[PDB]
Design a protein around this ligand. Structure first.
Ligand SMILES: [Zn+2]
Ligand SMILES: [Zn+2]
Ligand SMILES: [Zn+2]
Ligand SMILES: [Zn+2]
Ligand SMILES: [Zn+2]
Ligand SMILES: [Zn+2]
Lengths: 340, 340, 340
């Protein structure tokens, strides 16, 4: 929502309130998504300034406030900055920005990230190139220098983030993505490799001096249909946890498959079906083990551009004897969303 | 303050800066409110969208930022989401919303919550139905389906919130409230019962498989007078602490009494007097013990709809030999408030 | 950016997104500023309401969100309230405000706080009077009661803030500052003394029942030139740390010198040079030791009032055998800033 537009600078304030509850069998400790209150809220701004006829500068900030916490010590659990960056965009040259932003491999994994609540399981945060990561300098080019419409690409430099935990750390890396869009279809591929930190190497699970993440994707977004498919492969990058021996690390190799189909009815109801399967391989002590494996059946009711209800059902196919202890129960999310 | 109003969605941004200092005898450790800097700030939004002529959707978010902290490790102490919810309101049918919101029993305890700084002692947060609680689905009906003016009611389902601490947890519950308003008067009553969590049961103080909170109230809000009275009773719900044996839990039974009288002078000065007395009973090892017992004398000076000063004096009647260790000293709050 | 202006209340929303990276030799553990991602974002409001023709009320809130954190446990590290206060301003009488605000001695140290990223090293936060401190009641008078133009002064009462750590605590204090501005020049002096807390006294480093901070300054801000110089002296106030014996406390005495020179080119480039030297004396076990000692060479490119790039180089003169373990390596900051 544009709240300022004077003297060649415009600022949009964005926010949503999401009333959200998850339902699962017991405590939800052996379920896909958990059990209980998951209400959150989001606030941010997006400003673009016209420096000259060809040059424009921008900045985005986006923050998540959890409303499912109390007023005691747990008051901040889940609060985080999603995105926070600035950059410059010139004519038909491209754009450059640095900050906390989407990894370039999310240019591909975003195709199947359309479920009312869930989906996009492989797009972990603070995981190199698949999700929101800190310290990324990203060059992007749309319409290939204004010569070929629909043909976009991007190159990204990931800065080293040596943090307290191996889960949220990374070393230097490079990545890129190419995409084409024609008459309703979009195809995309993205790749990224980076150095691992010593602390990551020192974990039980995962072994290798380099992490690697790539993925392809196809989508059809027209005539009220949304159909998409993603395939991705990772090396030493997907974060895993053994809930039995209570160790953590990274999967030496994962094969990721995400499918999704939605139809948008005129009167606002948007049903969806989806498949998601992530298989880890060469896991220390375990061997092969599935991380994610479900079918999804859901629907969102759009009242208008500002209000929506949704239900999302996960038919979890993960077996009860999963070697890594991955939860095997189903989970249902029921949501009510005000956004501007 | 309305900052957006285009295409049937309006958004209000709200905020206040509250310069605030408390004065007490020693460290304030044996006082009502404490001693030192209590400056805070608040920010939120409130959006309502017109879906059709009869249906409207809304969302509220409200956040508290403490300014009395430092820039070190204590930087977030007191920061919290007060409210965060969305819902739908239809014609003369009623409204429904889910999220972190006021407990339905606060429909009654809000009558005496009008002191410049203090008062409303029984409306604890994260305490079932008396204050701000997370995961509440609330149906509300004003003017009894548009048939009887002044006659409002509400029913509320409290979701289970199993947290790390027994103080901030709760199980499933139901509650409701009815109110009538006529020629300046308002009468109200509210009730709520809920299951306790196992962790709550396992505490030294309090015993029972169910928590219970109810209260009645009368107010007179006209001719520049504000007069209100509240009476409430709780079972296994009021959080208590024994500062001697350093244990905590819940009071098996409390009797709550809150009175308040204010007059609003034309030139902005609004003096107030108030009484508050909360007596816990059947406390393990202690027996009977008062939790709150004071007289209040204060005044607010309203410069206008955006600026105010206030002083609030608590004449604390709690005895120095209180069995639970409740603080017995007086406390004075001096405040300066900018709000929009 | 003014987002509301109805009925004699105006509200400005402010924010910036700062993409920022520091470069240093190894881990940055022996460097001036460190090494890695330093992206942050800021949001706040500033409201002023016209109560009558002579009286106006105001309020400021300003918050810092770190974007260089992850989404795990370190998600809030660095998040803080910078400022949060309200007050009243009357005609030619002056202004009064209370809250978390700038110490009065910053009226002087702000002269040399103009580097693209660094500088202003002596203006520590939560350090009595030199930086952002909590619980300050400040009277300010501009143009000496409207009689002498350019002649401003301020008196400040610092409230006691007894916190968990000795670094961020303080006792009661008073301070003041006087400044004159004439044909492009500004001269200033400020003084402040305060009681130390018992916890501060109990530290290894620093000894004395009272803290003391004063400083003078000259600036020339015209004809596209910025030239400034600061000299300050502290007693028992400057926070120090011995990274060898891993102790902390306060310096019994510091001599502070800050110089800065900048030129603003028409086409947006603003190069800068600066010197900064802070010498601690009478340090327990150490004797004399330098805390800060560098030359700075940097430049900011201003695209316009909303967008800028900058590079800041610190030529660190601190010797590798510094007795307190102060880092001796150079550091380079590269920044891109969107602000409104
Ligand atoms: Zn965003
Ligand atoms: Zn995103
Ligand atoms: Zn509110
Ligand atoms: Zn409230
Ligand atoms: Zn500010
Ligand atoms: Zn400041």
């Amino acid at each position: 929502a544009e709240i300022y537009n004077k003297d060649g600078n415009k600022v949009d304030l964005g926010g949503k309130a999401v009333g959200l509850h998850y339902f699962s069998k017991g405590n939800g400790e052996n379920s896909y998504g958990g059990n209980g209150d998951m209400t959150y809220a989001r606030l941010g701004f997006k400003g673009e300034t016209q420096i000259n006829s060809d040059l424009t500068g921008y900045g985005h900030w986006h923050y998540n406030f959890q409303g499912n916490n109390s007023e005691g010590a747990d008051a901040q659990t889940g609060n985080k900055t999603r995105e926070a960056f600035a950059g410059l965009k010139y004519a038909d040259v491209g754009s450059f920005d640095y900050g906390r932003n989407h990894g370039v491999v999310y240019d591909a994994l975003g195709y199947t990230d359309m479920l009312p609540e869930f989906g996009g399981d492989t797009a972990y945060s603070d995981d190199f190139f698949v999700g929101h990561v800190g310290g990324v300098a990203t060059y992007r080019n749309s319409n290939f220098f204004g010569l070929v419409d629909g043909l976009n690409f991007a190159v990204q430099y990931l800065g080293k983030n040596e943090r307290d935990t191996a889960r949220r750390s990374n070393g230097d890396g490079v990545g890129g993505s190419i995409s084409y869009e024609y008459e309703g279809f979009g195809i995309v591929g993205a790749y990224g490799a980076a150095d691992r930190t010593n602390l990551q190497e020192a974990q039980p699970l995962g072994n290798g001096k380099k992490a690697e993440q790539w993925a392809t994707g196809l989508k059809y977004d027209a005539n009220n249909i949304y159909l998409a498919a993603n395939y991705g492969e990772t090396r030493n990058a997907t974060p895993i946890t053994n809930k039995f021996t209570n160790t953590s690390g990274f999967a030496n190799k994962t094969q990721d498959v995400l499918l999704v189909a939605q139809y948008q009815f005129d009167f606002g109801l948007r049903p969806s079906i989806a498949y998601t399967k992530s298989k880890a391989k060469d896991v220390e002590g375990i061997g092969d083990v599935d991380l994610v494996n479900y079918f999804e059946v859901g629907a969102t009711y759009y009242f208008n551009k500002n209000m929506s209800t949704y239900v999302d059902y996960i038919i979890n196919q993960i077996d009860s004897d999963n070697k890594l202890g991955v939860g095997s129960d189903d989970t249902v999310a029921v949501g009510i969303v005000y956004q501007f």
